[PDB]
Design a protein around this ligand. Structure first.
Ligand code: ZN
Lengths: 55, 47, 304
């Protein structure tokens, strides 16, 4: 029931879900494209879920 | 240009857009921060 | 919207990406995206420090890239802090950019001119310059070496003058990189630029956040000298009704323009004034059917 963890009914697999659900640089470009403001994207929650964001 | 504009509804900032090509036309107010999206159906407008 | 607006936005973006650092690019892109912005709007969108935006705003004001507006308004809590609005003056910005690039290339041309002369002679003990014109009177009687007046030291040749090709290459590397600026000002000078202000920039604003402390509505002050279409559809039956109306205003107009009874008639002869086919058509339709079988917050308002 928690939105932080996503469950796959067809596979029986639990995965971690983040507020900024970005796991690829393409997803990062899609997230920056979807911004209607010029607000910066915080890297504090970008570490959450997707393990590496610096490189 | 005329159909879209920045607005304040219920002391909340947003964008008013006119969804005119759809039948019937609607007045869509979109939250700037993404909190709430509200569409007004124009078939029930009195004044 | 306006392609010229997109062009001058590209101008501002390219000049801040070329001749300015990244934080300048950030604040300039923030002002270009949201047309009118205050200091709290920048501190909310960019998470920037006041001491960090200090040199940025100072440099962008000195280069006339960001216009500052000193309007204060009246919030409901009446805490009217002197908020400053950061916007863009497009003719002022393009004039400043054109003047800066013209002064850079003119100063480089003057540096090339001052490098075009011969080398000259340096005195390293006293660290004193000597041109070819003023070193004529300092030679000895031995006719061997340039002797200084103060140090009496053998002078050495300057390395300047031989860097003429280096300055020419610097001009070549500046000029091809600034070529998009020249190509874009070719389109700008062939177009018409409207003079925008704070009120003009208010017409194209983008909200930075949900709750803005600074109100964007302009508050004027006294003493500052610084339609509808309606259609009528008639199904070919009510034309006689409109003619009945037309003759009715005709007859009331003739009645109101008629002579009075005392005018057209003499009043001296009277006393003085003082104090069923439905069954038939049903049977008809039955007969035709049988035959066809046979052969087959509140404010003031106005309504607009
Ligand atoms: Zn010397």
């Amino acid at each position: 029931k928690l939105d932080r963890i996503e469950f796959d009914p067809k596979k029986g697999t639990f995965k971690y879900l983040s507020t900024y659900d970005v796991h690829s640089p393409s997803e990062l470009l899609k997230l920056l494209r979807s911004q209607v403001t010029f607000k910066g994207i915080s890297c504090k929650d970008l570490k959450d879920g997707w393990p590496q964001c610096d490189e | 240009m005329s159909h879209s504009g920045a607005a304040i509804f219920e002391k909340v900032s947003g964008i008013i857009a006119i969804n005119e090509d759809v039948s019937p036309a609607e007045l869509t107010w979109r939250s700037t921060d993404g909190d709430k999206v509200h569409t007004v159906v124009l078939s029930t407008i009195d004044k | 919207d306006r392609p010229i607006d997109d062009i001058v936005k590209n101008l501002l973006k390219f000049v801040v990406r070329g001749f300015y650092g990244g934080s300048f690019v950030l604040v300039l892109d923030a002002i270009l995206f949201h047309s009118v912005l205050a200091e709290d709007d920048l501190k909310q969108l960019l998470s920037i420090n006041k001491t960090e935006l200090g040199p940025l705003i100072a440099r962008l004001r000195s280069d006339r890239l960001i216009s500052i507006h000193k309007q204060r308004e009246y919030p409901p809590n009446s805490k009217s802090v002197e908020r400053v609005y950061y916007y863009v003056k497009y003719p002022h910005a393009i004039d400043a950019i054109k003047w800066k690039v013209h002064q850079v290339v003119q100063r480089l041309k003057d540096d090339l001119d001052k490098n075009s002369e011969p080398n000259g002679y340096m005195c390293p003990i006293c660290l004193t310059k000597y041109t070819q014109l003023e070193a004529v009177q300092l030679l000895n009687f031995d006719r061997t070496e340039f002797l200084c007046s103060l140090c009496d030291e053998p002078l050495v040749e300057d390395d300047s003058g031989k860097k003429n090709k280096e300055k020419q290459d610097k001009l070549n590397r500046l000029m091809d990189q600034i070529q998009p600026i020249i190509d874009s000002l070719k389109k700008i000078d062939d177009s018409r630029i409207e003079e925008n202000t704070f009120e003009i920039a208010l017409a194209r604003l983008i909200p930075p956040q949900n709750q803005s402390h600074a109100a964007y509505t302009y508050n004027p002050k006294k003493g500052s000298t610084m339609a509808t279409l309606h259609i009528n559809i008639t199904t070919a039956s009510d034309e006689v009704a409109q003619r009945e109306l037309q003759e009715r205003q005709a007859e009331e107009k003739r009645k109101q323009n008629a002579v009075p009874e005392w005018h057209k008639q003499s009043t001296i002869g009277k006393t003085a004034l003082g104090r069923e086919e439905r069954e038939n058509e049903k049977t008809l339709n039955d007969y035709y059917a049988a035959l066809a079988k046979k052969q087959a917050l509140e404010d003031e308002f106005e309504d607009v």
